[PDB]
Design an enzyme around this catalytic site. Structure first.
Site, PDB file in Angstrom:
ATOM      1  N   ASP A 106       0.761  -1.252   0.000  1.00 49.81           N
ATOM      2  CA  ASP A 106       0.000   0.000   0.000  1.00 49.81           C
ATOM      3  C   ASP A 106       0.796   1.310   0.000  1.00 49.81           C
ATOM      4  OD1 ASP A 106      -2.016  -1.821   0.194  1.00 49.81           O
ATOM      5  OD2 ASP A 106      -2.992  -0.913   1.936  1.00 49.81           O
ATOM      6  N   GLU A 136      -7.263  11.836   8.827  1.00 42.09           N
ATOM      7  CA  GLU A 136      -8.055  11.940   7.589  1.00 42.09           C
ATOM      8  C   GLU A 136      -9.236  12.908   7.608  1.00 42.09           C
ATOM      9  OE1 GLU A 136      -9.060   7.792   7.681  1.00 42.09           O
ATOM     10  OE2 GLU A 136      -7.429   7.271   6.308  1.00 42.09           O
ATOM     11  N   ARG A 184     -11.036  11.686  11.956  1.00 45.06           N
ATOM     12  CA  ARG A 184     -11.160  10.317  12.441  1.00 45.06           C
ATOM     13  C   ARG A 184     -10.224  10.039  13.614  1.00 45.06           C
ATOM     14  NH1 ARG A 184      -8.956   5.334   8.722  1.00 45.06           N
ATOM     15  NH2 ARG A 184      -8.919   3.699  10.332  1.00 45.06           N
ATOM     16  N   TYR A 223     -14.693   4.876   2.884  1.00 48.64           N
ATOM     17  CA  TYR A 223     -14.385   6.267   3.193  1.00 48.64           C
ATOM     18  C   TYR A 223     -15.429   7.240   2.690  1.00 48.64           C
ATOM     19  CZ  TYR A 223      -9.494   5.796   4.700  1.00 48.64           C
ATOM     20  OH  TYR A 223      -8.340   5.532   5.381  1.00 48.64           O
ATOM     21  N   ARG A 272     -17.811  -1.857   7.304  1.00 50.26           N
ATOM     22  CA  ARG A 272     -17.906  -0.643   6.514  1.00 50.26           C
ATOM     23  C   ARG A 272     -19.078  -0.707   5.552  1.00 50.26           C
ATOM     24  NH1 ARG A 272     -11.501   0.021   6.283  1.00 50.26           N
ATOM     25  NH2 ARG A 272     -11.355   1.987   7.429  1.00 50.26           N
TER      26      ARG A 272
END
Ligand SMILES: CCC(CC)O[C@@H]1CC(C(=O)O)=C[C@H](n2cc(C(C)(C)O)nn2)[C@H]1NC(C)=O
Ligand SMILES: CCC(CC)O[C@@H]1CC(C(=O)O)=C[C@H](n2cc(C(C)(C)O)nn2)[C@H]1NC(C)=O
Ligand SMILES: CCC(CC)O[C@@H]1CC(C(=O)O)=C[C@H](n2cc(C(C)(C)O)nn2)[C@H]1NC(C)=O
Ligand SMILES: CCC(CC)O[C@@H]1CC(C(=O)O)=C[C@H](n2cc(C(C)(C)O)nn2)[C@H]1NC(C)=O
Ligand SMILES: [Ca+2]
Ligand SMILES: [Ca+2]
Ligand SMILES: [Ca+2]
Ligand SMILES: [Ca+2]
Lengths: 388, 388, 388, 388
Positions: A69, A196, A211, A322, A288
């Protein structure tokens, strides 16, 4: 001419859909970037979707995702809102495993972050060419919003985080004119954790929703005046807006401190309606999956639990992720205020699905003066693809 | 500056071809959107083709079509007239399973419709950003033209239908300036049924040709003055312009009421030449195969059966479908009038062919002062594709 | 402002390369239109490559070529010079199995031809929208240049042919301002045959080089003053510029009449240097293989055989085909004259090669004041492809 | 208006990343040109990446590479910096197996070189159209920089090499205004060898760093005043900047003559900081693996070995290659000076890897006033591809 953004947020009763790009559906045969962390900002002429790449494609072996990532193959590119992130409609923005992007009326100021985690670098492009840089001040994973930044009167403000993700980290506020850093400020929010941030312009100041990946199932809140003086804390609302979280009833809420003894988080947004709040969250309180958004009365100023409205955009039968904020320029909407619009990421593949890759599609919604119905505008693709 | 569109329709003796995109032929190897309901509108600089997507591609598994029609993956995109609806030349317009789009001289005002059928929402984008909304007033499948809308002097007019498709439904007329709804009106046409109108500017008013999915094999007709006063009814012509229909001789015709005791319909267009009409229809009276267009003398004002001309564009050996109207701006054609141009959809695959998908290609024709020959400009692709 | 084109042709000693698109090489994996008859015209800002399509792609089954030539799936599209004719960079121009295209300083005026051969139609688009039409006057295959047309001072001139291909046909000259036909003229050239003219601006007049598919291995020549008065005949040169042809020595030549008792032809170009000529032809005198270009002294005015220069662009080991003329605007080259540039088509596949398809790539050359070396810039692809 | 470029080079302490295109990673499924020798130049609005093609694609049989290097299928195309060289985002520039490209404020002046090696031709396009030509003066492989050329005040300067690659060749300096050659000069540097120069604007003059493929493991240096008066020699630094080379300690260095008795070379860059130098080189002293860049104090004026800084961009575990210079216009960066930016090519495939093809990806870095960390931004693709 510099885009003003001094006006207030439009009081909205609901959100009508802006876009849907279906890239993962398109990318079954097309040439689409395996992306992560899309987000929308608008210029006084158009709104674009930013995202991060591995330089891979859907259905490719280069989408194998074992590829890490925080990688060097990671870039920031943009396309128009609603277009998929494809190879042939993409505009290069920055080398980035973490980003923010914003327009001020004249040019795009992007801020992608890269390097090693020990000494990561953030480059400020402006007009396409890199103009300035911010270096890792703490030596633990330099990073930023993953959502739109905010320019007001030609000065662009944003929020970075250097430190750890679980324990206490350090949080800063930067300020630029024409891609050249003109100011900075440290955030003396102790015990608290800020990650974020989803931010926006509101009455000449910058409000950012964030967050808490440390101890909070509720969400931090920062208020930024253009001199970098700040008030910080938490969204006072008695409704937990983070995920994972708990029941709304086993939650009191606080305007200052982190509540709900859960770790982790997810990127999330909020919008301040005078004293009320448009807060967004997933439906599942542990996963999520799903997405919904609630107007909580006096939730910006008081530990309220009064749900004025509850609108659903993504159903709990479907995957999300997100979410972040942005505005519509007056030079676009025609209003006297700044229309609150937002995007939701919908994650498919790993870690939940039987694939080898991880990407996302989006839907965008924006603020209307009417009540919008609950439907599910979800991702669509039928996994696994042929590559898997 | 606002595009005038106050002039009259050009008296034309025929239609010369504008375009052909061959997308389903291109899409045997290319990246083309499986689309449905294409249509053409023009700005004072270019004409674009709108369409609706599933976010799928030709030859993909995502084209399996089992994926439903009124779906959330449904978007409105545009390309230039003649270009195919491909991923890499497409401009995102709206989330839409039903649409209309139009330009007024300055920006594009689109109106895509989505949500659940019970409480569907129609969003008005303008300049790309959503500007206003219209909500489901009757709670049965909110919908609109699927063809160009009409702006006259900066005010854009169109027609929506809330209700059932077979029995009596409700029909309305909306009006916008700069994407902000400035007017509306109910259509008190009882017994009658109005669907999918093909409209145009004519002497400062908006004439729209429509489809009767209730009881009429002839076609409804609406006349709209810019104050939303209206006259409504049927195209007086003794020629049945809908499909399915019957023989022309077993048809009398009416200027007020629905004739020909058939149900169903198809989208269709017409053009008023003073007192005559350029009416279009399929060749087959039961299927959507073929396409032809006839000038019927005094057919706008009288129950006439006098065919002045009969031009063929799609032969009865080949599949067609929907059809709709639009004009050429004076700022493009150079005329003193508004050139009548039209498009025909050509459907391939399901439900008629041995495939798993359903898309369409188009041909566009526009109004000339000469007599054009009968030829077939049909779709082309050789079905089934490899995916099937 | 209207592009002047009143100046004279530049006296050039050679031709330096402009472009090469390698589409058939690119199209082994890419998405490239199977095209035929490419050609170049330039605006006062850019030069584009026009071509005709079947709406097919390389390596597709839709490239099977059994699909005919004079077909309805045939369109005129353009790309920039050097870019391949791909789906994602193409601009739609017209439905066309025969074409010409030209720019006048303001907009592009295209003229694609279609319909049935008995009553074919030619539509004049201008600015993208069709503006005027010319109908089949003789009822045998209405057609035009397949190369650039010519605008001088805002008036655009070109050459059409209605009649048979072998025996005597009829030839005309058209004239337009802003896509609206303002003049026309018949060409009383008896016994002679005029096809596929390559034309250009020269001292306020239009000179066109053509092809004799009847009885001539030499090439027809037309001179057009802007009042449509004309002188016509043949390129006086004692060198046979057509193909098939014979030896140069078994050829006398004529400035009036067709020489060399061969049938057939090929599209070809020429350029008048005061009294000399830059004539182009294939190397093979029987096939379309190779390409070369010779300056013949006093060859425009006299039956000369004096080769001043002989430059080779395509070798006789490689396939070529059509060829045509155009100029560079003063607004591009910077000169005081009009730079003579030309393109050569390179045909691969059927009828010569073991494939199922037929396409072409191009190279473009333009006029320099130096002597350029002989090399082969040929097509490249390695046939047959996977589809075959 | 003509882009000034009279200012000095910015004194920089490091280089922050500009871009990364991942084309070979994208091109596992996408449509990407197999390229060689990419390079970056910037206009006063954007920076583009130039490259050379075979008209082939990644994963194609036309990428078989047996297809030679100095070939006719070789073209110069450009894309935006960071975008990959794909078919659908590419702009055609020239037919070229060797190139240079540069912008002067108004239009792009490109100089691609082609033909046979005996009599190669270099064409100067300007605005897209060829404007002038330079012919082979020595008859052995006419060639040029492969990196950005330099325009100062509307006059564009560059460096060509006619002769042999191993033994003594001949070197020249050209000068153009609006694509028309206005000057030229021979380089009387005997014993020395100049290839593939990386150049830039610095205090009204053009400094170019080059490659010695004869006898030097150190690098030639040319200084060009706009009257074509020159000083030439070698980068005085006691650090060998070429590759192959030897140890830094077994190297003395010279400001006049070639040192290190190795043959061969690689394209490389340098930047003059007053008296210091930012020199770049590979990590491996024998292979092209890795890339690093060192500021050597007083290394421009003295045979110094004082490394002020050592920054790493490509690690010695990964493949690299060519490298070259360019600046950022004041009209982009906002500075009072010219920001030193550079690109590094990363070669994959043949001759080192088990494939059949040879392409490259790039990373671009530019000059900041801060110290950037050492990381590896390398190519990425996982070879061999499916074609191999
Ligand atoms: C909590 C904030 C950061 C701290 C490293 O972690 C992010 C969390 C997260 C998630 O799944 O919730 C995804 C984010 N993320 C970002 C990425 C890449 C692919 C590097 O862009 N992958 N994951 C994290 N941000 C990073 C690693 O820079
Ligand atoms: C008769 C008008 C409407 C009423 C629902 O029905 C349309 C009829 C029709 C046809 O085949 O004739 C196709 C149209 N249609 C439109 C679509 C989608 C794929 C939703 O855009 N599919 N079919 C119908 N419009 C809808 C469903 O919104
Ligand atoms: C001699 C001029 C015409 C008369 C029909 O014939 C063209 C000859 C020719 C050739 O191979 O030499 C190719 C040309 N051609 C053009 C096409 C299509 C594919 C229709 O564009 N195919 N062949 C002929 N032009 C037509 C058919 O309109
Ligand atoms: C040393 C300068 C030239 C002299 C021919 O050689 C270049 C050397 C070189 C390398 O690997 O180092 C690659 C360069 N190169 C360039 C190319 C092509 C594919 C022709 O663009 N292939 N290799 C050489 N330049 C040429 C052949 O024009
Ligand atoms: Ca949390
Ligand atoms: Ca009906
Ligand atoms: Ca002949
Ligand atoms: Ca060397």
């Amino acid at each position: 001419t510099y885009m003003n953004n001094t006006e207030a947020i439009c009081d909205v009763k609901g959100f009508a859909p802006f876009s849907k790009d279906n890239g993962i559906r398109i990318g079954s045969r097309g040439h689409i970037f395996v992306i992560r962390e899309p987000f929308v900002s608008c210029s006084p002429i158009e709104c674009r979707t930013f995202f991060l790449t591995q330089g891979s494609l859907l259905n490719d072996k280069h989408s194998n995702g074992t590829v890490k990532d925080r990688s060097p193959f990671r870039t920031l590119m943009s396309v128009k809102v609603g277009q998929s992130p494809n190879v042939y409609q993409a505009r290069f923005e920055a080398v980035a495993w973490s980003a923010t992007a914003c327009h001020d009326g004249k040019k795009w100021m992007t801020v992608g972050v890269t390097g090693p985690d020990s000494k990561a670098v953030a480059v400020i492009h402006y007009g396409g060419v890199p103009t300035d840089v911010i270096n890792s001040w703490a030596g633990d994973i330099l990073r930023t919003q993953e959502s739109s930044c905010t320019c007001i009167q030609g000065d662009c403000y944003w929020v970075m985080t250097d430190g750890p993700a679980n324990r206490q980290a350090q949080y800063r506020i930067y300020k630029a004119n024409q891609g050249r850093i003109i100011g900075q400020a440290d955030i003396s929010f102790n015990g608290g954790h800020i990650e974020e941030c989803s931010c926006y312009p509101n009455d000449g100041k910058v409000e950012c929703v964030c967050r808490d990946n440390w101890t909070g199932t509720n969400r931090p809140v920062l208020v930024i005046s253009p001199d970098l003086s700040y008030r910080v804390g938490y969204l006072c609302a008695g409704i937990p807006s983070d995920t994972p979280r708990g029941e709304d009833a086993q939650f009191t809420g606080s305007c200052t401190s982190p509540m709900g003894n859960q770790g982790y988080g997810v990127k999330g947004f909020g919008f301040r309606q005078g004293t009320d709040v448009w807060m967004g969250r997933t439906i599942s309180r542990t996963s999520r999956s799903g997405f919904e958004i609630l107007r909580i009365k006096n939730g910006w100023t008081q530990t309220s639990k009064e749900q004025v409205r509850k609108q659903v955009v993504v159903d709990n039968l479907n995957w999300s992720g997100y979410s972040g904020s942005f505005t519509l320029p007056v030079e676009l909407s025609g209003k006297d205020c700044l229309v609150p619009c937002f995007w939701v990421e919908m994650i498919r593949g790993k870690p939940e699905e039987k694939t080898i890759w991880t990407s996302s599609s989006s839907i965008v919604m924006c603020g209307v003066d009417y009540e919008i119905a609950d439907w599910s505008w979800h991702d669509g693709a039928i996994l696994p693809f042929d590559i898997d």
